[PDB]
Amino acid sequence: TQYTKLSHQLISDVQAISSTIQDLQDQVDSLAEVVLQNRRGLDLLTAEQGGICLALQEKCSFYANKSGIVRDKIKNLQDDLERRRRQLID
Amino acid sequence: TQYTKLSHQLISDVQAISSTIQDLQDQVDSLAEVVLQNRRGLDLLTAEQGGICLALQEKCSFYANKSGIVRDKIKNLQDDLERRRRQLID
Amino acid sequence: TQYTKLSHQLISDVQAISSTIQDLQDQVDSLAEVVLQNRRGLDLLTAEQGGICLALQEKCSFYANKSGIVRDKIKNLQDDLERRRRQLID
Ligand SMILES: [Cl-]
Ligand SMILES: [Cl-]
Ligand SMILES: [Cl-]
Ligand SMILES: [Cl-]
């Protein structure tokens, strides 16, 4: 009874954590669309300067997206929790 | 002894993870304020064009905030860990 | 056999979660560089107005970075998982 209970608690905690990580990736993705449109906007406004990075005389920063990596890992983890719940009944 | 130890370890890990998720939401919220002010700034600069999205001739991106969802879930999880610690003593 | 198995599962879950949190911090850091360059860009374009916040007649938003806090916590957690794996063999 004790081992399955702690097993159940682990699955529940990991599920809750996984949904929260999804929420964070959801926000990062949403915010990133706004930020990259803002960069396109600044590049438009400074087109004659060659874009905002050249206007600033700076090394240019670009976004390194990992949305697919995170979403796959979370889905694969959630799929494993589904299997684990089943085996606790069985 | 073993079961409470693994129980203790689960609670400690989940607590540490939960604080790190809070940190991520803290940064997302902070960065989002900067990004949305940047959008207001671009919309001001291109007011005569109808704002930055129309100036870019693009579908307009807006931010989808989930801060309250995440913060509630984390607080509710931390509250449960508090109860679990108590029951391990009891 | 059961206790080490659930112990193993906890370590594996926490490891997977920790890597995903790293991914999120990686994206936040990358996106933050783009956002802060965008702010410098807007401040350049509105230099005569005193920068974008004064041009907007708004309280100015600045980014509160916690990258080092998160990365340390994750590395320290991963180091502990390494020790725990070893003790499960021993
Ligand atoms: Cl489990
Ligand atoms: Cl931005
Ligand atoms: Cl527990
Ligand atoms: Cl463990």
Instruction: Name the residue ranges covered by the structural domains of chain C.
Output: 1-90
Nearest chain A residue to C24 by CA distance is A25
What residues have CB less than 8 Å from C35, skipping those under 6 apart? A35, A38, B31, B34, B35, B38, C63
> Which of A39, A64, A77 comes nearest C38 by C-beta?
A39
| Of B24, A34, B66, nearest in space to C29 by CA | B24
The string over B27-44, giving b where at least 16 C-beta atoms fall within 10 Å of a residue's C-beta and e elsewhere, is bbebbbebbbbbbbbbbb
Contact A67, A25 (CB under 8 A): yes
Contact residues, chain C, for A14 at CB < 8 Å = 13, 17
Distance C6 CA to ligand 1 centre (A): 6
Whether residue A41 and residue B62 make contact (CB cut-off 8 A), yes or no, is no
Chains touching A (at least 3 CB pairs under 8 A) are B, C
Instruction: Specify the resolution in Å.
Output: 1.7
Among A15, A19, A20, A28, the strongest candidate for a mutation testing the C interface, having the largest count of C CBs within 10 A, is A28
Whether residue B32 and residue A27 make contact (CB cut-off 8 A), yes or no, is yes
3-state helix, strand, coil in chain C (%, to 5): 85, 0, 15
Whether residue B35 and residue A35 make contact (CB cut-off 8 A), yes or no, is yes
Closest ligand relative to A4 C-alpha: 1
Q: How many CB atoms lie within 10 A of CB B77?
A: 20
CATH classification (class only), B1-90 = mainly alpha
Contact B27, C65 (CB under 8 A): yes
CA distances to A7, A90, B61, B85, C12 from A84, rounded to whole Å, are: 9, 10, 39, 25, 14
Contact B26, B74 (CB under 8 A): no
What residues have CB less than 8 Å from C6, skipping those under 6 apart? A3, A6, A7, A10, B6
Contact residues, chain A, for B84 at CB < 8 Å = 9
Distance C76 CA to ligand 1 centre (A): 23
Q: Is the dihedral of CA B12, B13, B15, B19 positive or negative?
A: positive
Name the residues around ion ligand 3, CB cutoff 5 A: A 9; B 7, 10, 84
Q: How many CB atoms lie within 10 A of CB A33?
A: 15
Note the helical H segments in B1-90.
2-45, 52-56, 67-89
